[PDB]
Amino acid sequence: GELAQSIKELAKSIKEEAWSIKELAQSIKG
Amino acid sequence: GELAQSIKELAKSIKEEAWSIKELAQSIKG
Amino acid sequence: GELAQSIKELAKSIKEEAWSIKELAQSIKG
Amino acid sequence: GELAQSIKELAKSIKEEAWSIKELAQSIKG
Amino acid sequence: GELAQSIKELAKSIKEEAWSIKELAQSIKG
Amino acid sequence: GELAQSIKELAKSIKEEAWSIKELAQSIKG
Amino acid sequence: GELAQSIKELAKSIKEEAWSIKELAQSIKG
């Protein structure tokens, strides 16, 4: 139910953050 | 409940800990 | 009882973390 | 019992993390 | 059940984030 | 039992993360 | 059971993240 759903939303947000951090790394890189 | 009664706030705090990321993931792109 | 109380404490801590991540987002954005 | 105790320990650790993220925000802001 | 699954998804996302943070560190390094 | 133990392990890892974030804060401040 | 296992996986991932954040701190410090 709602708890599991919330944790899935959190997991999704952290994936988005991971993607942004990768983009920041790529922008610093050559 | 709170966490996402208690579990319920838990869902609230875990969901809200999810928004909070969407704004980081996002602040780092810009 | 004690279990419900512990989960309420957890929910509170996750809200504090959400607030800090919001602050981190704002500091990056500024 | 032990479960409630473990969740209290988890809540404490998350508060520590929230404090560290706030400190990271302050260091970026300064 | 669904709860365990959600936590597994969270664990996966955090590993991705850890990898991205490592990449950001490598890009800063030199 | 095993559940409480797992949550204690999770609490430990989150403390280590909080320590690293504190170190990141100190490195930015310096 | 599977829940405890999932939480153990989460704990491991957060340790990996702590290590990466430490590496990011080291790269900023250098």
Nearest alpha-carbon partner for B10 in E23, E6, G23, G26: E6
Amino acid C27 reads S
**Taking CB atoms and an 8 Å cut-off, how many pairs form between chains C and D?**
58
| Domain count across chain G | 1
CA pair distance G10, E9, nearest whole angstrom = 9
Greatest Cα pair distance in chain G: 44
- For the CA atoms of C6, G17, B12, C22, the dihedral, rounded to the nearest 10 degrees, stands at 120
Q: Which residues of F touch G9 (CB under 8 A)?
A: none
Judge whether D2 and C2 are in contact, CB under 8 Å: no
With b for 16 or more beta-carbon neighbours within 10 A and e for fewer, the F1-30 pattern comes to eebbebbbbbbbbbbbbbbbbbbbbebbee
Cβ-contact G3, F4 below 8 angstroms: no
C29 has a chain D CB within 8 A of its CB: no
On whether the CB atoms of residues F24 and G21 are closer than 8 A, the answer is yes
DSSP label at residue B3 = E
Tokens standing for residue C18: 């959400």
The residues facing B7 across adjacent strands are B2
Q: Which of F7, F8, F22, F29 is the mutation pick for testing G, counting most G CBs within 10 A?
A: F7
End-to-end CA distance of chain C: 44
Q: Which domain holds residue G29?
A: 1-30
- Note whether B29 contacts A: Cβ–Cβ < 8 A: yes
**Resolution in A, one decimal?**
2.2
* G5 shares contact with chain E (CB less than 8 Å): yes
Residues 6+ apart with CB under 8 A from A27: none
- Structural biology method used: X-ray
Nearest to C8 among B2, B16, B20 (CB): B2
Chain D: touching chains (3 or more CB pairs < 8 Å)? C, F
